[PDB]
Amino acid sequence: FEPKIVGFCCNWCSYGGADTAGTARMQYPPNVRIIRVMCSGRVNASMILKAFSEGADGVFVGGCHIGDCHYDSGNYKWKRRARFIEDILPEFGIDKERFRWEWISASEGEKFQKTMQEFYETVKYLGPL
Template sequence: MCTGRISEEMITRAFDKGAGLVFVGGCHPPGDCHYINGNIQCQEMLEKIKKKVLPEKGIDPERLRLEWISSAEGSVFQKVMKEMAEQLERVKT
């Protein structure tokens, strides 16, 4: 299963349930996607959600973050998670 599997409903459900932040992680475009272009299709979908769906629901699009991180980039993942944890602290207050 690819990030391309992620549907609008999953993102909206998460925010409806009150999730602090939502992170989507996939493989680097263009070449790293095991499913050819599922990552890019995911990106298209998320851009739409950030631009339209979330603002319409009154949700700050910054609470949804997409990053391409390969399995060899542990330090990148760590960095992103640390940043998001800090962001979460700010969002909560």
């Protein structure tokens, strides 16, 4: 079983963190697919639900650390949305461990690598949705 994982990362920190992991050449499983947004505040539950409905076995969202958002308040709104999404997902048979959201700074390549590896292990263990 090879899980299908979709990722959303803000342009300024989390996408920067993935770039840092790449430049340092920190290996991690190739299942994730990153989609760029300007801010984690651009992400809403419709995208997560669409991902899970289209065949995703896990959804990752990455943002700036609280207090570090380029647009200064977007990740707060995302954090609220993410808590609500964790509320909603188990009602349709989707474990909330299949939906991970983390704060990754632009220089935190190693944290991004570890998050990717661990999320892949979790989703693979859970098995197909």
